[PDB]
Design a binder for this molecule. Structure first.
Ligand code: IZA
Ligand code: IZA
Ligand code: CL
Ligand code: CL
Lengths: 265, 264
């Protein structure tokens, strides 16, 4: 008896997918307006059906419903049936940012900083609401429309996003020493994104996955002159202030926006 | 629909009153008014506690029988315990090691049940270990206060394991969630105090206590442990281990020769 999404939206081409998600272009039957419909497969232990837990779906949905910013996708409706939760989301048609940048001729640092600034604005909005994205990477940085003079960044995939934040005689050492994961992880990811934006190279990427993980944990990277010889010193400083091991030492999003490199843009 | 009575206890954002429908305990939890506010308990934290209580059914753990809500408070109707805190009952009583293990076994049974459901209590201490009724020949332990209890995290909660790790922060790469082992440390401390009346890591200030815990700075002063067996000391030593992965688990604790022994 729940409202069926197909009674309100006609479904079209598949646009993307994940382990437990399929995204289709759809058209609102009432208006003709186009959206993206994200079908999230529900876990059903009873039927041995693998999928996303109720709690995880609720987490993502509750975050999406709070978000209203021009650089983040917007949520328009929610449907649920036996097997799926279906989210009607803002349609982004310009593809991945880094695919668009690859197609450009003579991409300059100043032009690159313009897109980075949009990413900072979206993240500043998120962090102002205590939302960490936790999966900031090029594949989650889309463009609304790539056939415009100044294409607009749209962040997607809030699948692992989280809202952040007596006697001690009986607490364990790991509790004493506990430091929760927070907004700082996004700021590290921004550092990595900035490095690849300015160079075309991934800073921690190893020949094998174990090497990559080792590099990240040691914070082992370089500004190779092949790629960085004519990158501004302000850009390198921006990156260096984000790619530090201690989360509490990293620039926060407000600091990032007040950095001389960004203030110049 | 419930006639309230006297105030039984309180915490930072909770007050418990005796009530009658059949007598019960009425836990009043104050809701945060604004998500940004530091005053009161968030909706998510209340639901978390309720969901834990709803799925637990075990003789050594309090049960949930009803829920009520308004703009300011969430009220849980819980099983009433009238035997007080365990340690008070033992204080008014000397106590043999064998008698001490009879009560500890019930604590271990309740924790075993929780851990079987991947729930860590996270606030095991004497004040949360009650007796259902202290005027019977074999009093039953009842664990209370699931205010910070959690189902233990998946491990891919903060990480997309289906994608590249290239943009992931080192604290996520090296993330170690809190787990069931924290309760097992707490059990070691409870056991130490049960046998000696002394707190192993207690310092002059809260920060000193925390520093002692972090260094695992304790001993078995003969002043307090002259009459304690080597097996009891061994049980405690196997729980008060810094590395959570080298600490006794609940099943190992139950198999330990100090507990496994048959008693009257
Ligand atoms: C698979 C994942 C859930 C990350 C996702 N992929 C897309 C996507 C892929 C291609 C495309 F043209 C559009 C989208 C898209 C979209 O347009 N809106 C919201 C999410 C979303 C999306 N969300
Ligand atoms: C403060 C805290 C929430 C931990 C709590 N205190 C009590 C409590 C205190 C004295 C007493 F006689 C009974 C209780 C009691 C109880 O009887 N049932 C459930 C919880 C609970 C409780 N829960
Ligand atoms: Cl998405
Ligand atoms: Cl309680």
């Amino acid at each position: 008896f729940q409202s069926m999404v197909e009674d309100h939206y006609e479904m079209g081409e598949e646009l993307g997918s994940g382990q437990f998600a399929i995204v289709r272009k759809c058209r609102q039957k009432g208006t003709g307006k186009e959206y993206a419909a994200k079908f999230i497969k529900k876990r059903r232990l009873s039927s041995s059906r693998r999928g996303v837990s109720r709690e995880e779906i609720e987490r993502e949905v509750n975050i999406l419903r709070e978000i209203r910013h021009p650089n983040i996708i917007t949520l328009h409706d929610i449907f649920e049936n036996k097997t799926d939760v279906v989210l009607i989301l803002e349609l982004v048609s310009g593809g991945e940012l880094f695919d668009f940048l690859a197609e450009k001729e003579s991409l300059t640092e100043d032009e690159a900083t313009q897109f980075l600034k949009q990413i900072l604005d979206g993240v500043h909005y998120l962090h102002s609401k205590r939302i960490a994205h936790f999966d900031l990477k090029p594949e989650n940085i889309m463009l609304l429309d790539k056939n415009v003079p100044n294409p607009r960044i749209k962040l997607i995939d809030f699948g692992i996003a989280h809202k952040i934040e007596g006697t001690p005689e009986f607490v364990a050492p790991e509790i004493v020493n506990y430091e929760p994961l927070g907004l700082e992880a996004d700021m590290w990811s921004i550092g990595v994104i900035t490095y690849i934006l300015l160079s075309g190279a991934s800073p921690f990427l190893g020949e094998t996955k174990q090497e990559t993980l080792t590099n990240i944990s040691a914070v082992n990277y370089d500004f190779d002159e092949e790629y960085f010889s004519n990158t501004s010193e302000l850009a390198k400083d921006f990156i260096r202030r984000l790619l530090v091991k201690d989360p509490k030492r990293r620039m926060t999003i407000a600091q990032s926006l007040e950095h001389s490199w960004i203030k110049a843009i």
